[PDB]
Design a binder for this molecule. Structure first.
Ligand SMILES: O=c1ccn([C@@H]2O[C@H](COP(=O)(O)OP(=O)(O)O)[C@@H](O)[C@H]2O)c(=O)[nH]1
Ligand SMILES: *[C@@H]1S[C@H](CO)[C@@H](O)[C@H](O)[C@H]1NC(C)=O
Lengths: 695, 14
């Protein structure tokens, strides 16, 4: 009893010193002396949980709660452990019991809110976070988590004050040497200084170091040449998103496009096989594919990478879901680079480079990044659209009356043959146009009746809203559609006689300043609508209320459901102009709208995430779409919506250049990527530490 | 999307 107290005390001490294993041994000794020690079980459990020994931690949490039925803190922490074991129902049960035992337990309410948040139930998450803050006004984790929920649904109540408080919270936590309550990925959304944003990321980098230092592994011996690999550079791509995810939608063709004479490609998957064609392709085309999801230990996984003799290890996650940055903290490779999947600095000394470009990351702002800049010659962004959606390379329209390029649209691999079977097809200078005859009436009839598909002259004509019922793999982008697809403004309730401005981003990317800008544009172009997505639906009423407050009637903004991947890209053809979000641009989303031939207006900011769209447009060759300030953004968007000849010119420009520019040219991109890798390697091989590669 | 799933870029747990 008394002896057990001192043993538990000593363990706490050794724990603080960082001697985790001595702490464990001492906790166990305390239990050996006095088995019914609730605090000792809870302490050991917390330590085991920190080491990642979750099943073992669970044992001791269960002991603590039996010995002490009012031990709310233990139920709460046990819930945290179950959450990490991916037992969500279990975690919720624990948090629920914790709150029942002690209704004033602030942490338990916040923990419950996080379950609701991760489950997609934002309104319930908000309710629980507010309860936590009502119980404990000074609660940074809960305030910041609440702020992000509010962002997600476009609740901008007390917005300016909220932003000020977030910055204030971060400044205080950075001073007091604690992990900031704002996630580095979310830090792009708040008016934090570049210094603070880098500092937040650096804290996360140091977490990874802390976790691998306990492995006490020595620094790895790295290769000094390419002799053992027969002159080939061994490149390792590490991603949790080899499968159905935007990352693969952008880069799935790259591994197979590497030059085998000079490169040996290893893909390290952090996720299990999800059964999709995206995963199939990377596994089939990489020289080697290693499933690290089967190797939980970061030490063993890093050993595996080093065994392969990787020269350049590529971090495609940064601080995103499924990341295992501990692998990079262990430095199994001599050169480690951030690429594509994370729009910000890692802030981590174990990352050498970030692959970016001069437009996204001008050399003047290198101080925002901990990594050295490594420039691709055009943009660092890329997309697999030419391979995934080749049916959108060409289009035809149906004249249902002047001639419109975006009211009624057909696309298909066999579109040419179908057109060739029709009489009276006209070519507009090149866009094929079908007149308002029997063929065209039959198509519009299909759409109105909600019919799935029809047949004309033996050709399969599909309703664009019904792709999942015809071919689900084609709907998700896993397969190219094998039918001719119809897409119409009437499918989405869009006006036939007006300008359509679109933005297909998640609503969290919008802020008050942005919506006001959009309202200014709509007011200046009376014959126009703004087209947004229910992303999520619960954001819709907030946007509508704010628009109504700005003087816009409900009919000026049209919402559509989120669509399967192929339909989302295809329906971009119906818009006239995309209005990009300046706070955080469309990234994947930007590539999607440009592939449909839609001009995108953007205003690059200072953060990487706010500059991507401008980089894409610069590569594309449309400098006139890039605004230097809010007034110019409005003037550009209004010009496109009112000067109809100008609109035609720019749309024609986007339509042509998505093919002729490097933007969607995955072979060119890979070759430029290879050139950059070799610059990195030669620099290292000659005995130099990383330096900016900006020429 | 409703009836399916639309994966997005998401933060890791902390
Ligand atoms: O109606 C839609 C809207 C978007 N998307 C896809 O959803 C993802 C959006 O992810 P995120 O918001 O992270 O895109 P990003 O920030 O890269 O623009 C992208 O893959 C889009 O192609 C979709 O499939 N259907
Ligand atoms: C989503 S994934 C996409 C592909 O790797 C990446 O480029 C993009 O930056 C991500 N979006 C955000 C907001 O983080």
């Amino acid at each position: 009893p008394t002896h057990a107290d001192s043993l538990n005390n000593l363990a706490n001490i050794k724990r603080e010193q960082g001697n985790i294993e001595e702490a464990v041994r001492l906790y166990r000794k305390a239990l050996e002396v006095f088995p019914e020690f609730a605090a000792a079980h809870s302490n050991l459990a917390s330590v085991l949980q920190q080491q990642g020994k979750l099943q073992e931690a669970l044992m001791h949490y269960k002991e603590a709660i039996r010995i002490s039925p009012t031990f709310a803190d233990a139920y709460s922490n046990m819930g945290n452990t179950l959450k990490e074991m991916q037992d969500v129902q279990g975690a919720l049960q624990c948090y629920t019991r914790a709150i029942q035992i002690n209704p004033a337990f602030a942490d338990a309410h916040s923990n419950l809110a996080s379950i609701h948040k991760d489950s997609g139930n934002i309104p319930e998450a908000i309710a629980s976070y507010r309860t936590a803050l009502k119980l404990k006004p000074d609660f940074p984790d809960a305030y910041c988590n609440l702020a992000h929920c509010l962002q997600i649904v476009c609740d901008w109540t007390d917005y300016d004050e909220r932003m000020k408080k977030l910055v204030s919270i971060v400044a205080d936590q950075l001073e007091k040497n604690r992990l900031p309550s704002v996630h580095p990925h979310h830090s792009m959304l708040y008016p934090l200084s570049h210094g603070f944003r880098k500092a937040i990321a650096e804290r996360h980098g140091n977490l990874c170091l802390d976790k691998i230092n306990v492995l006490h592994k020595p620094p790895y011996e790295h290769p000094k040449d390419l002799k053992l690999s027969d002159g080939r550079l061994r490149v390792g791509y590490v991603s949790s998103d080899f499968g159905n995810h935007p990352t693969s939608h952008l880069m799935q063709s790259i591994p197979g496009m590497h030059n085998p004479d000079k490169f040996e490609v290893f893909c390290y998957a952090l996720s299990p096989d999800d059964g999709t064609n995206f995963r199939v392709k990377v596994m089939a085309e990489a020289n080697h594919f290693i499933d690290l999801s089967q190797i939980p230990c970061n030490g063993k996984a890093a050993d595996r990478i080093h065994q392969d003799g990787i020269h350049i290890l590529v971090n495609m996650n940064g601080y995103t879901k499924g990341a295992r940055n501990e692998l990079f903290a262990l430095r199994p490779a001599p050169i480690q680079a951030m690429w594509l999947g994370y729009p910000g600095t890692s802030g981590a000394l174990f990352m050498d480079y970030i692959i970016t470009d001069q437009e996204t990351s001008p050399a003047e702002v290198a101080e925002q990044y901990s990594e050295k800049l490594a420039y691709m010659p055009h943009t660092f962004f890329i997309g697999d659209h030419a391979n995934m959606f080749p049916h959108l390379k060409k289009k035809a329209v149906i004249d249902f009356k002047h001639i419109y390029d975006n009211r009624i649209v057909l696309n298909g691999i066999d579109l040419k043959a179908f057109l060739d079977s029709l009489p009276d097809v006209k070519i507009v200078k090149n866009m094929p146009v079908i007149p308002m005859n029997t063929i065209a009436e039959a198509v519009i009839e299909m759409i109105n009746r909600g019919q799935i598909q029809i047949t004309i002259n033996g050709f399969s004509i599909s309703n664009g809203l019904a792709t999942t019922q015809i071919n689900n793999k084609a709907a998700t982008g896993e397969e190219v559609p094998r039918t001719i697809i119809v897409t119409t403004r009437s499918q989405y309730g869009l006006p036939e006689d007006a300008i359509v401005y679109c933005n297909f981003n998640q609503l969290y990317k919008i802020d008050p300043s942005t919506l006001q800008m959009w309202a200014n544009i709509l007011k200046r172009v009376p014959n126009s609508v703004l087209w947004l997505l229910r992303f999520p639906a619960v954001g819709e009423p907030n946007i509508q209320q704010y628009a109504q407050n700005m003087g816009l009637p409900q009919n000026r903004i049209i919402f559509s459901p989120v669509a399967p991947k192929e339909e989302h890209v295809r329906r971009g053809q119906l818009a006239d102009v995309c209005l990009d979000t300046p706070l955080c641009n469309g990234h994947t989303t930007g590539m999607d709208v440009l592939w449909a031939g839609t001009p995108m207006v953007t205003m690059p900011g200072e953060t990487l995430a706010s500059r991507v769209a401008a980089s894409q447009l610069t590569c594309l060759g449309c400098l006139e779409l890039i605004a230097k300030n809010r007034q110019e953004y409005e003037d550009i968007a209004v010009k496109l919506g009112t000067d109809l000849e100008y609109l035609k010119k720019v749309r024609g420009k986007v339509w042509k250049q998505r093919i002729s520019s490097p933007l969607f040219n995955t072979k060119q991109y890979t070759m430029e990527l290879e050139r950059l890798y070799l610059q990195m390697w030669e620099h290292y091989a000659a005995g130099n530490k990383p330096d900016h590669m900006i020429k | 999307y409703p009836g399916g799933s639309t994966p997005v870029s998401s933060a890791n747990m902390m």
